[PDB]
Amino acid sequence: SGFRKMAFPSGKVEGCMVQVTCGTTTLNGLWLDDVVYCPRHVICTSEDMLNPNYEDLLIRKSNHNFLVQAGNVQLRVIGHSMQNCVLKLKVDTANPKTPKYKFVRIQPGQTFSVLACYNGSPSGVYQCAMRPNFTIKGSFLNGSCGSVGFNIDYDCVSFCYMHHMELPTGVHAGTDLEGNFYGPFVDRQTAQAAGTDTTITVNVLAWLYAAVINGDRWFLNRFTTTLNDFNLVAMKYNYEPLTQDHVDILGPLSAQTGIAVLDMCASLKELLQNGMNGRTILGSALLEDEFTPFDVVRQCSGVT
Amino acid sequence: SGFRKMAFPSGKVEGCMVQVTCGTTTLNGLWLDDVVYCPRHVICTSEDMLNPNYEDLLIRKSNHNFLVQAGNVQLRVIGHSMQNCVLKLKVDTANPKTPKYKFVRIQPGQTFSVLACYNGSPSGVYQCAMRPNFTIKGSFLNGSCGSVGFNIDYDCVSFCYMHHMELPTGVHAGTDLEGNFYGPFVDRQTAQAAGTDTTITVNVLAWLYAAVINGDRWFLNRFTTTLNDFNLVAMKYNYEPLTQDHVDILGPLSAQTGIAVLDMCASLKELLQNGMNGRTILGSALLEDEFTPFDVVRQCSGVT
Ligand SMILES: O=C(Nc1nncn1C1CC1)[C@H]1CCOc2ccc(Cl)cc21
Ligand SMILES: O=C(Nc1nncn1C1CC1)[C@H]1CCOc2ccc(Cl)cc21
Numbered sequence: 001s002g003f004r005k006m007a008f009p010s011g012k013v014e015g016c017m018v019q020v021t022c023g024t025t026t027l028n029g030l031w032l033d034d035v036v037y038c039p040r041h042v043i044c045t046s047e048d049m050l051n052p053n054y055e056d057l058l059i060r061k062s063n064h065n066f067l068v069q070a071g072n073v074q075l076r077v078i079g080h081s082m083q084n085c086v087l088k089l090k091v092d093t094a095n096p097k098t099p100k101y102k103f104v105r106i107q108p109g110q111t112f113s114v115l116a117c118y119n120g121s122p123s124g125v126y127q128c129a130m131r132p133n134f135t136i137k138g139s140f141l142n143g144s145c146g147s148v149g150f151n152i153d154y155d156c157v158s159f160c161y162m163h164h165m166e167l168p169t170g171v172h173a174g175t176d177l178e179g180n181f182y183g184p185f186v187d188r189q190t191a192q193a194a195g196t197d198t199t200i201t202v203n204v205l206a207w208l209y210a211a212v213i214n215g216d217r218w219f220l221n222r223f224t225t226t227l228n229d230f231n232l233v234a235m236k237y238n239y240e241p242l243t244q245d246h247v248d249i250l251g252p253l254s255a256q257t258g259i260a261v262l263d264m265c266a267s268l269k270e271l272l273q274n275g276m277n278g279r280t281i282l283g284s285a286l287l288e289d290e291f292t293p294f295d296v297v298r299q300c301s302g303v304t
Numbered sequence: 305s306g307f308r309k310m311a312f313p314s315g316k317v318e319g320c321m322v323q324v325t326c327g328t329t330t331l332n333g334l335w336l337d338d339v340v341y342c343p344r345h346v347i348c349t350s351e352d353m354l355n356p357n358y359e360d361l362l363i364r365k366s367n368h369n370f371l372v373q374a375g376n377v378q379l380r381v382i383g384h385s386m387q388n389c390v391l392k393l394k395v396d397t398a399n400p401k402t403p404k405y406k407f408v409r410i411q412p413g414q415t416f417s418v419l420a421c422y423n424g425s426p427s428g429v430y431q432c433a434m435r436p437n438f439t440i441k442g443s444f445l446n447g448s449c450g451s452v453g454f455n456i457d458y459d460c461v462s463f464c465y466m467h468h469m470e471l472p473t474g475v476h477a478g479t480d481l482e483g484n485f486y487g488p489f490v491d492r493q494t495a496q497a498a499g500t501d502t503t504i505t506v507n508v509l510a511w512l513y514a515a516v517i518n519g520d521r522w523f524l525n526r527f528t529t530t531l532n533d534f535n536l537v538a539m540k541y542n543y544e545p546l547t548q549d550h551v552d553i554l555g556p557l558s559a560q561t562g563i564a565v566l567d568m569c570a571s572l573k574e575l576l577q578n579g580m581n582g583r584t585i586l587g588s589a590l591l592e593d594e595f596t597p598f599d600v601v602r603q604c605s606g607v608t
Contacts, residue, residue, distance in 0.1 A: 001474045004443040006428035009419060011315025115313060121608035124310035125429055137587065139308040141606045170305045170519055215474055275582070276589075283441065285580075285589030302445045304425035 001214045003207075003282050005290065006299060007113035008152040010125045015097030018075070019120030020089070020146065021067040028117040028146030029068060029089070030159065030177070032098050036068050036075070036089040037177060038146045039164045040082055041187045049189040058082055063089075069120060070095070084179030085187050086162060100156040103177035108132040109200040109240070111292050112149040112160050116140060129203065129290035130161075132240055133195040134183025135171040138163070149174075154304075167192050199239045199289050202246040205264050206293040209253035211282045213300055219281060220259070223266040230265040237272045249293050256300075305518045307511075307586050309594065310603060311417035312456040314429045319401030322379070323424030324393070324450065325371040332421040332450030333372060333393070334463065334481070336402050340372050340379070340393040341481060342450045343468045344386055345491045353493040362386055367393075373424060374399070388483030389491050390466060404460040407481035412436040413504040413544070415596050416453040416464050420444060433507065433594035434465075436544055437499040438487025439475040442467070453478075458608075471496050503543045503593050506550040509568050510597040513557035515586045517604055523585060524563070527570040534569040541576045553597050560604075 020029040020038045023045070029038035041049065043057050061080070066089050068075040079090030106112065111129045115122050116139060128136045128149060140147065140163055149161030164174045164187055171194050173185040185192050212220065231241050247261045254261050268287070276285055291299075324333040324342045327349070333342035345353065347361050365384070370393050372379040383394030410416065415433045419426050420443060432440045432453060444451065444467055453465030468478045468491055475498050477489040489496050516524065535545050551565045558565050572591070580589055595603075 001445075001470060002441060002443040002476065004428075004430040004432075004441075005309060006420070006430045006443060007311060009315075009318050009426035009429055010313045011318040011426075014313050014315040116310070118606045118608050122313035122315075123606055123608045124308075124603070125313055126308040126310045128308075137306060137308075139306040139310060139603060141305075141604075143606065166305060172306065278579070280590065286584065299428070299443060300445075302422045302427055302447065304422050304427045 003210045003214050003299065005127050006295075007125045007127045008150065010113065010115045010122065012099040012152065012157050013115045013148065013150055014122050015099070016095060017115070017117050017120050017122060019069045021069075022061065022065055026119060027143060028120055030146070030148050030162070031068075031070060031075075031091070031095040032101055034091050034094045036091055037086050037162065038089070039162065039175075039187065040085050040087045040179070041145070041164065042066075042087065052188060054082065082179075085164065085175050085181060086177070086179030102156060102158045104151075104158045104160050105176040105178070105180070106130050106160045108134060109203060109292070110160075111290055111295055112151050114138055114147060114149050114161070114163070116144055117147045118143040127290060129200060130182060132198045132200065134185070135167065135173055135194045135197070136161070138172045140166060140172055148177075167194060169194060196238060199237070199287065201234055201239045201242050201289075202249060202293065203289040203291055204239070204287045205242075205246075205250055205261070205268060206253060206296040207282070207288045207291045208264055208268060209250070209257055209259070209293075210291065210296045210300065212257045212259065214282065216281050218279060219267050219271055221267050221270055223270065224260070224263050225266040225269055226262065227265075230262070230269055233269045233272055239272070252297055253293055307514045307518050307603065309431050310599075311429045311431045312454065314417065314419045314426065316403040316456065316461050317419045317452065317454055318426050319403070320399060321419070321421050321424050321426060323373045325373075326365065326369055330423060331447060332424055334450070334452050334466070335372075335374060335379075335395070335399040336405055338395050338398045340395055341390050341466065342393070343466065343479075343491065344389050344391045344483070345449070345468065346370075346391065356492060358386065386483075389468065389479050389485060390481070390483030406460060406462045408455075408462045408464050409480040409482070409484070410434050410464045412438060413507060413596070414464075415594055415599055416455050418442055418451060418453050418465070418467070420448055421451045422447040431594060433504060434486060436502045436504065438489070439471065439477055439498045439501070440465070442476045444470060444476055452481075471498060473498060500542060503541070503591065505538055505543045505546050505572075505593075506553060506597065507593040507595055508543070508591045509546075509550075509554055509565070509572060510557060510600040511586070511592045511595045512568055512572060513554070513561055513563070513597075514595065514600045514604065516561045516563065518586065520585050522583060523571050523575055525571050525574055527574065528564070528567050529570040529573055530566065531569075534566070534573055537573045537576055543576070556601055557597055
């Protein structure tokens with residue numbers, strides 16, 4: 001038993017991390033097959049970032065200007081192209097450590113692990129959620145750009161995020177591996193305010209199921225509710241509306257614990273209305289929303 | 305910016321995980337050089353665990369009874385010995401993926417990453433602290449025994465923990481890599497109650513410094529305190545006593561923020577006495593104690 005904010009093992013992704021330098025800018029790249037993926041803002045100076053014309057800036061760059069280093073060995077760049085906000089640097093060597101992989105665009109509320117890197121070297125791994133306002137709350141310093149988010153299904157790594165920037169509010173923004181930003185954000189140093197950071201309701205419920213499975217039951221009450229009644233309370237508390245799709249997704253957790261989804265919604269409703277009263281749930285004093293129902297099942301079953 | 309419960313990249317440790325089976329028991333082992341380390345309770349049946357005589361049980365086991373599998377390939381066991389609560393299985397092949405490593409016995413309050421494994425395969429990685437009562441609060445299911453805790457200094461992996469059991473209270477106990485248990489626990493299915501789980505005061509202060517560095521400053525007050533006055537409050541709240549050694553260890557964080565350690569102790573004192581009042585610090589509603597002052601410096605500087 002016990003429930004932890006668990007990240008995927010990062011070894012498969014560590015073997016893909018490289019350093020990419022263009023001029024005076026060094027960031028991280030992802031080396032998969034004979035392609036290195038990195039944020040296109042590697043071509044920018046700090047001045048350029050204020051209003052960059054990436055196509056115009058890219059004209060002044062040749063293959064030899066992109067310095068790609070894997071460990072202590074240099075990769076030869078034989079091609080470069082821009083796909084949305086990412087650059088794809090074709091190298092002459094396929095990464096021998098390339099795992100089975102996919103590029104996936106996640107939905108808000110989904111979780112992933114981030115392997116934070118600096119100069120192509122891994123510093124740490126943590127679990128994140130794509131917030132409903134399309135930001136992530138990570139831990140990224142200067143040089144962390146190009147660090148990636150991913151999920152693993154046994155031996156296939158699904159890359160879902162590449163880190164690009166920190167908004168003036170300290171939250172993070174990035175793209176999928178096709179270079180498309182999550183949300184309305186652009187790779188420009190400009191006023192970009194995030195929208196409302198609502199709570200991922202289906203994730204909180206999944207985490208409440210994880211608590212029951214792991215012994216924390218104090219919050220279970222004698223009440224039930226309806227999707228409409230629950231949603232009225234969820235609106236008031238900046239919680240995402242719960243749909244029948246979410247109820248169906250919670251089905252296996254409901255079956256395992258014997259607690260109907262709407263009964264758990266009524267427990268969540270009372271927690272929102274009365275608070276925790278100085279108590280904790282799974283060692284947390286707030287309602288945790290960065291565990292999906294799939295993460296809960298996976299962690300509680302031991303998927304390797 | 306941003307501060308996350310970050311684990312070390314686990315690739316170096318993933319390459320050491322093997323499956324060890326003895327009879328009907330399968331658990332994880334750590335393969336370093338030509339030795340596989342695993343909990344000695346791999347030789348036990350569920351009945352034996354009630355009152356095992358490990359030396360007597362071990363007499364009935366030969367090298368061929370320990371089945372060691374690395375991925376899909378079997379390792380030949382050419383020797384076996386018991387060192388405290390761990391078995392050391394000598395194999396005929398040195399692990400080609402053996403990283404630079406040390407075996408270290410950590411002190412209560414120190415942190416480490418756990419690579420949770422099942423059948424020699426990694427399932428996930430999370431950051432833990434050795435509690436002051438010598439337990440850890442992990443996420444371990446049946447089959448997770450032999451999963452290890454470690455820290456990394458650039459390329460050297462310091463193994464500090466091997467998972468052995470879950471106490472009836474859901475907390476976890478284990479040994480260092482010499483097989484010595486942390487705390488008073490024994491590898492026997494018996495009444496083993498944990499002592500008081502006090503809060504790691506020096507870690508909370510380090511995390512309060514991390515909050516200031518990352519923008520969360522609401523809790524800073526106009527007060528100061530003394531080590532003795534602070535410790536009176538810390539005793540009342542089941543916080544570990546703060547020593548001058550702890551103040552010295554917080555020195556670089558104090559210097560970076562310009563907030564004297566005793567002033568931060570006065571902030572912590574008011575937080576203990578008044579609570580958070582429904583507010584959060586680094587996205588937490590409670591005082592976090594599983595970040596050491598070294599973790600805070602490391603995360604805030606970007607050590608790879
Ligand atoms: O935000 C940035 N990258 C990063 N990633 N995670 C965190 N941080 C930094 C620490 C903010 C870059 C990309 C956008 O253009 C600029 C412009 C100025 C500066 Cl200082 C940084 C950046
Ligand atoms: O606690 C155990 N290992 C484990 N590790 N982390 C978690 N869990 C299990 C889930 C409790 C083992 C070792 C002690 O002897 C026994 C005896 C009975 C049983 Cl059921 C398990 C065990």
